[PDB]
């Protein structure tokens, strides 16, 4: 009952954490991403996070456990706030415009290495006023359409 786009988005999210593509999320990877998002969790908290969904008790999070974790952690915060957070993640210098270089640097930092051509294309997918950049209004439009 999920759309292939949604599944694709969750798989993409999973891969951002699973930077070594070994198939699982470790406390290390969970910590890496969170840190890349302005957070600073302790090892104890990271361990707690995994154990809360580690059904097979192997010390790591697999895809089905990841989705389990996400399903409950995004029910204690609504969309608009999350969308706003993502924008802040992309707009590094916070000048209100997501540039092509910022999009590229950000995704690389999260593990998704993209070419200048690809990133330029992504920007074009959300750009509405054709200035080659994505402002909050355009970003929100993409995330809600």
């Amino acid at each position: 009952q999920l759309t292939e786009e949604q599944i694709a988005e969750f798989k993409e999210a999973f891969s951002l954490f699973d930077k070594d593509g070994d198939g699982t999320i470790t406390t290390k990877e969970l910590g890496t991403v969170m840190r890349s998002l302005g957070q600073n969790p302790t090892e104890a908290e990271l361990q707690d996070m995994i154990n809360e969904v580690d059904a097979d008790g192997n010390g790591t999070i697999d895809f089905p456990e990841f989705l389990t974790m996400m399903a409950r952690k995004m029910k204690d915060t609504d969309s608009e706030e999350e969308i706003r957070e993502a924008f802040r993640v992309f707009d590094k210098d916070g000048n209100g415009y997501i540039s092509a270089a910022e999009l590229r640097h950000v995704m690389t930092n999260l593990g998704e290495k993209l070419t200048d051509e690809e990133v330029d294309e992504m920007i074009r997918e959300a750009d509405i006023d054709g200035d080659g950049q994505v402002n909050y209004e355009e970003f929100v439009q993409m995330m809600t359409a």
Binding site: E12, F17, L37, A86, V106, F139
Partner: peptide, 19 residues
């Protein structure tokens, strides 16, 4: 197959909910 901004942005939206 090839990534779109929407897909990638939502991945980040999802990932950022852990904050």
């Amino acid at each position: 197959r090839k990534k779109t901004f929407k897909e990638v942005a939502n991945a980040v939206k999802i990932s950022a909910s852990l904050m």
